[PDB]
A paper describes a structure:
Protein-engineering methods have been exploited to produce a surrogate system for the extracellular neurotransmitter-binding site of a heteromeric human ligand-gated ion channel, the glycine receptor. Acetylcholine-binding protein is a highly conserved ortholog of the pLGIC extracellular ligand-binding domain (ECD) with properties similar to nAChR. Mutations affecting key residues in the orthosteric agonist site at the α1(−)/β(+) interface affect the potency of both activation by glycine and inhibition by strychnine. We therefore set out to generate a high-fidelity surrogate of this α1(−)/β(+) orthosteric binding site using the 2α1:3β stoich­iometry [Fig. 1(a)] by exploiting protein-engineering methods and the thermal stability of acetylcholine-binding protein from Aplysia californica (AcAChBP). Ultimately, the highly stable AcAChBP framework has allowed us to introduce nine amino-acid substitutions that have resulted in a stable surrogate for a heteromeric neurotransmitter site that binds glycine.
The structure of the GBP–strychnine complex displays a well ordered ligand in three out of five binding sites per asymmetric unit. In two sites the density is less clear, the thermal parameters are elevated and different strychnine orientations are noted. An overlay of the protein structures (data not shown) places the tertiary amines within 2 Å of each other, but the ligands adopt different poses, essentially pivoting around this N atom. In the GBP–strychnine complex the tertiary amine is protonated and donates a hydrogen bond to a highly ordered water that forms hydrogen bonds to the carbonyl groups of Ser163 and Tyr166 and contributes to a solvent network that burrows into the protein fold (data not shown). The G162E change directs a polar side chain into the bindng site and this forces the strychnine to adopt a different orientation. The change in orientation of strychnine results in the amide carbonyl O atom rotating by about 90° and relocating by almost 8 Å directed towards Met133 and with the indole system placed to interact with loop C. Here also there are significant changes to the protein structure. The side chain of Tyr205 adopts a different rotamer, participates in van der Waals interactions with strychnine and now occupies the space that is filled by the Cys207–Cys208 disulfide bond in WT AcAChBP, in essence forming a lid over the binding site. Tyr212 also displays a different rotamer, partially filling the space vacated by Tyr205, and this allows the strychnine indole moiety to bind under loop C. The substitutions that were introduced to engineer a glycine-binding site in GBP have however reduced the affinity for strychnine significantly away from that of the wild-type template as well as from that observed with recombinant homomeric GlyR samples.
Numbering used by the authors:
A (entry chain A), C (entry chain C), D (entry chain D): 20 to 225
B (entry chain B): 20 to 225, 230 to 231
E (entry chain E): 20 to 231
């Protein structure tokens, strides 16, 4: 533990936290979604509730070390409060997102950070058709709330959402789940910005 | 990262935070509303629930910098915790407002701040008749909870609430939505305060 | 801005916080209620929900200054966390009081503090009869939770609850609403204690 | 104001917080309940909700002073955050307990602390028979969550719950309410630990 | 109080907290569930709610002391904020776990830590057949959220869940409940990680054994 204590001390107390990207030094965050459950549907308010975890990855030079200097430690875990995290938000949620896992991130000696918050989200979705063979499709965009595409880029590794942890006895069966990067335009600043649109097609289990 | 670290350190550690406006140095805050959804109506309690974000803009001399001394940085993002923010509140909500976005603001080199919190609001609104062609009208005033018109002025860039992100499959269709500055006076004091009145006319969604 | 900064540092950093009143320096807090809505009634649990705001006022010598020493500043606003505030509570609430306003106070150069929290309160109230012409009466006492009448006195400017912001399209119509100082007793110390009794008579709107 | 600030500084700043009891110095905590309302009953989940305040009392040498050194102050009120408080918990609650009053304690010159939190509690209770002349009985134990009887003893000043603030128009009428110290032994350890059993027999109001 | 204050000062104020385990100093955490109640079942959303506490136990050399040097104190209690705690999470919860107990741990002189948080948990469970004789079975896996099997091992003291504080008048009777260590592997990555699988077989209560 002494070497990990040194490393954490060297990375966190010896300088300020990363202040976020800039135009001069923009940042790529990769996202993927792992969908666990569609919990419920409210046809009186057109809200659907999802449970998923969201893998976020990025890389900072300020978080690199040489494993040789610290007992060959090649990665560690630390509170998400110790580091900068991207301001990724659901654009059409109808309640504050609920946090379902520990807010802890993994940091690798090359400066890669992996943060995988599990979340319960209520979002804008009209579920009319869900009690049918064809089912229903809803979507919700994830984006940095404040950064433009000059500062933050969002990427995915695959446009296919991971269903390997989807609850087999959910009330709702998944027919398709995609995560698609998109470039939007903001009129206020004239600048592009990026979202990942999560689109889920689902039906009441037969 | 270096220059941005320096800028933030210079602005936030090398002085205390803006203490808010006074009568000798008043402040103008511009507001506008981007209405996203009428989620829910409750005809048993006369409460309606709205999702929207609120664009807030103000300018402070103490937040200005010369980009040439900071690697040509012209703006940055920072947590709303690092700066003063106006105490704007819905005057007729029935629940604590829920925050739906990161509490982060954009600060520009001229000292302009833009802060755009997304919110869910339950407020006082009689939905009797919302299942009709004419729909219903409800209104909610936004104001500083503690500052009068001698310290804080509120204004809008437009009268029209922005409906470009309004949810197309909401249970409720928006018929109109306006945001209007009003000058009020508190009880018998004759002392002025300003609000922005959010008036929304809507009906149950509907040939189709 | 700098004069206000100086004032606040002089008041808050150069002395600790007011420790609360004592038998020998008791404090008077004036309360007034501004009723906004009876939001709902639950006849199966005998709980009624009110929205109001609560004007609180008190005066401390430690918060006085001379406006001429501070660029003619006569009043300022500050976070209620920066100052002492009285522990006024509804004695028969059935849920934690929910806060509907910014927790900021107004301080005037004579040492007067005004704090006006808005609140949603569930409290004990049998609404049986609300659907008639005569209506129903319910009441709730507000008091310091830990101070006696020897440390904290409560007073009202007026017996009449202010209804100038009562919602005109409330499900419930206010027939009368008073706020009346009362003196109480308690055999655990014998000391008197003060409450403001909010008495509201209402019915379903016609 | 000044004597009180000096006293509070002497007690809280000049020394750290009481760290809790030990086998060598055990601590007796007295409890007493003041039952305000049975707010509701859920027969589909066997949960009942009570509102009450719970008087907690203990005594620490470290909180003593001589009134003559502090201008004859014989007591004061302070934030419960300033002092150690016992970790008493309802052992069969079904929801986190909701705090209904300011978390402020009374400290006396002899080192006695009195802390009286108002609370709403959902707990495990089968209300079958509540609508009958006999009514129903439910119980919940209150105990230290982490201390044995070697460190903490609990007791009551009376075995009768105080009903003098019980809500007179509650849906539920109280037939008896008792509070009784009990000595338990953990599994096969022989190690004692104490609880106060709150037993309430109630029925639907005639 | 003085001997305890010294002890706490020497353990917490002279060094930082345990930073967690690493591949070269891995940690074993022991978990035990004490099931108190199945509070409700929601057949419209396939969520069930449990009340339980969860005994967690682990041992750190950095929290050891000689009782001789501290007035024979052999253990103490302290706020869970003062120490490292393991990031154990239920993997199929559908709401944030609700905390029902004070967040305080017990630390012994050998450097053992025992933290027993009382919880209400909603989790993914299809209750279809819960009204029958044989009832229904649901499962929830508990695991470190960020550590793999190279840094954290989880085990149980025994496979039977402790039912000695299960509510005698719950709406639901427990037919069995077990807590079993499992080895998983993440995706195709080949890399192990451990869970404790909480498996509860339950039915709506009926008086008598229900099969006669
Ligand atoms: O600086 C802003 C302000 C505004 O905030 C409301 C939310 C918005 C949704 N996304 C999030 C990032 C944002 C954007 C793009 C490019 C530069 C700045 C920037 N934002 C927000 C903006 C809109 C549009 C866009
Ligand atoms: O006298 C008051 C108290 C009252 O407090 C509740 C909140 C209010 C919102 N704003 C903040 C300042 C205030 C106002 C304006 C002019 C003189 C007095 C005065 N205040 C508050 C008042 C209302 C209205 C207004
Ligand atoms: O010191 C106390 C403790 C006790 O706390 C439970 C609630 C109570 C209701 N009111 C609030 C103030 C109080 C009171 C009156 C006179 C001196 C001290 C004092 N309090 C509380 C008391 C009871 C009674 C009373
Ligand atoms: O060994 C234990 C663990 C168990 O933890 C859950 C909470 C409990 C409440 N109190 C706190 C101390 C305890 C107890 C008493 C005597 C020896 C061991 C012991 N504890 C906890 C125990 C229960 C019961 C009791
Ligand atoms: O690659 C990952 C990411 C993923 O993150 C979500 C949470 C998980 C719970 N534990 C924590 C460590 C982890 C794991 C084990 C072995 C290799 C990679 C790996 N992780 C996480 C993983 C799951 C599963 C497992
Ligand atoms: C940034 O600022 C410098 C000097 O302050 C100026 O010469 C130029 O316009 C900008 N960028 C450079 C030189 O990269
Ligand atoms: C304050 O009032 C004085 C006269 O009483 C006046 O000369 C001056 O303009 C005011 N000062 C400030 C700083 O506003
Ligand atoms: C305090 O008590 C002393 C001793 O009985 C008494 O003489 C004096 O009147 C009191 N002092 C103050 C400052 O109130
Ligand atoms: C602790 O134990 C020692 C050695 O067994 C014994 O001599 C003594 O009585 C105890 N010391 C204290 C300080 O209580
Ligand atoms: Na959002
Ligand atoms: Na989880
Ligand atoms: Na408000
Ligand atoms: Na508990
Ligand atoms: Na209260």
């Amino acid at each position: 533990q002494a070497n990990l204590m040194r490393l954490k001390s060297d990375l966190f107390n010896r300088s300020p936290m990363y202040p976020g990207p800039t135009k001069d030094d923009p940042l790529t965050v990769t996202l993927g979604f792992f969908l666990q459950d569609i919990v419920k549907v409210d046809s009186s308010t057109n809200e659907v509730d999802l449970v998923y975890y969201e893998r976020q990855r990025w890389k900072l030079n300020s978080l690199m070390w040489d494993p040789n200097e610290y007992g060959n430690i090649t990665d560690f875990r630390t509170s998400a409060a110790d580091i900068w995290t991207p301001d990724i938000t659901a654009a059409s949620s109808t309640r504050p997102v609920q946090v379902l896992s520990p807010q802890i991130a993994v940091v690798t000696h090359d400066g890669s950070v992996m943060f995988s918050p599990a979340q319960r989200l209520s979002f804008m979705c009209d579920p009319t058709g869900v009690d049918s063979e064809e089912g229903v499709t809803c979507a919700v965009k994830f984006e940095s709330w404040v950064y433009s595409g000059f500062e933050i880029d969002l990427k995915t590794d695959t446009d296919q959402v991971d269903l390997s942890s989807y609850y087999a006895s959910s009330k709702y069966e998944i027919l398709s789940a995609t995560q698609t990067r998109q470039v939007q335009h903001y009129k206020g600043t004239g600048e592009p910005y990026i979202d990942v649109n999560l689109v889920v097609k689902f039906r009441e289990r037969r």
